[PDB]
């Protein structure tokens, strides 16, 4: 399959400070139609996962503007400009190019 590595495992941040999570893949994620198809999800404790970022840069409807993701080739990054109390949970990255569908390890965000 395709191995996805996230860094770091735990990222404690203080209220009002930026945070960054990095996702790396073993293979290139470009498709023959001209897109990349990498997604970033948020999971709150005791709740279903919901989607934040679809494709490299596009942001889902209802997602706050503080979530911004970018990257290319094999390295990708999700950045949060301001961290609030609703930003706790575990964040994941997937690829949607190659069979089978692979998820990331997961990064936990705690408030200091």
């Amino acid at each position: 399959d395709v191995v996805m590595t996230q860094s770091p495992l735990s990222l404690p941040v203080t209220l009002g400070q930026p945070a960054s999570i990095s996702c790396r893949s073993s293979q290139g994620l470009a498709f023959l139609d001209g897109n990349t198809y990498l997604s970033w999800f948020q999971q709150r404790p005791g709740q279903s996962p919901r989607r934040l970022i679809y494709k490299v840069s596009n942001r889902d409807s209802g997602v706050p503007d503080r979530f911004s993701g970018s990257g290319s080739r094999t390295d990708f990054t999700l950045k949060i400009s301001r961290v609030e109390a609703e930003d706790v949970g575990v964040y994941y990255c997937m690829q949607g190019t190659h069979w089978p569908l692979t998820f990331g390890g997961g990064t936990k965000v705690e408030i200091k």
């Binding site: 470009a30 990349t36 490299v56 290319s72 080739r73």
Partner: protein, 259 residues
């Protein structure tokens, strides 16, 4: 395709020199007062036709080498290497010229001091500076070449004078030359400008018996991995792109371009 606009890169604003060039920024041209504040940048942006540089005519020694050194610089700290009031007790530090005007008046550079005779005498000069700032210091000075011997006698009271600048990597001796020259910017005299880069732990000695444009402010430089100089007429805006051209920013994961 491009934006057509200059903007930020990796979350850092560029240094836009405006109507000033690099020489007018480092020497302290009176129309370049906004750039004399201690800051940081990602790349340097310049107007292709800038007309505010060396207001007094003269030759800038190793100007392109100074540009090549300043290309890979992330930040500077402007500090007072020699205080104007206290480090010259027996000279006149007030010197103005009509070639460098500020607000319809006569003024001089903001980083250089023109020393002239006081009470009919020009004593011998010897000053030293030691570096303790743990980074490279850019030191700038100048040597004055007058037009006739009467101006030399009225300003410095000596027919023969010399300047010697000595460091652990710089050793030079300068002698004024009096000759008849064409008028550039209303002045027939010249001032030749020189620069050096002190290393941490090093010392510099200035010795003079005449014709010295002493340093006033110096720059403490810090190096960085990626920076450069871009000539543009494109305006500043807000972005966070990862590529910048003189035409505009580019947002592609594509391998090629033709801009």
């Amino acid at each position: 395709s491009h934006n057509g606009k200059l903007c930020r890169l990796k979350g850092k604003a560029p240094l836009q020199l405006g109507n000033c060039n690099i020489a007018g920024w480092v020497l302290g041209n009176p129309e370049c007062e906004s750039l004399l504040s201690n800051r940081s940048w990602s790349y340097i942006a310049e107007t292709p036709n800038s007309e505010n540089g060396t207001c007094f005519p003269g030759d800038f020694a190793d100007y392109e080498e100074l540009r090549e050194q300043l290309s890979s610089v992330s930040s500077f700290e402007r500090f007072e290497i020699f205080p104007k009031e206290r480090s010259w007790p027996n000279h006149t530090t007030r010197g103005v010229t009509a070639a460098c005007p500020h607000a319809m008046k006569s003024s001089f550079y903001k980083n250089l001091v023109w020393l002239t005779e006081a009470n009919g005498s020009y004593p011998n000069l010897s000053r030293s500076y030691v570096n303790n700032q743990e980074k490279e210091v850019l030191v700038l000075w100048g040597v004055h070449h007058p037009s006739n011997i009467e101006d030399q006698r009225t300003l410095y009271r000596k027919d023969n004078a010399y300047v010697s600048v000595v460091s652990s990597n710089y050793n030079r001796r300068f002698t004024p030359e009096i000759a008849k020259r064409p008028k550039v910017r209303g002045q027939s005299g010249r001032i030749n400008y020189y620069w050096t880069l002190l290393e941490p732990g090093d010392t510099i000695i200035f010795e003079a018996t005449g014709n010295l444009i002493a340093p006033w402010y110096a720059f403490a430089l810090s190096r960085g991995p990626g920076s450069g100089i871009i000539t543009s007429n494109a305006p500043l805006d807000e972005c966070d792109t990862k590529c910048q051209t003189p035409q505009g920013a580019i947002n592609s994961s594509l391998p090629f371009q033709n801009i």
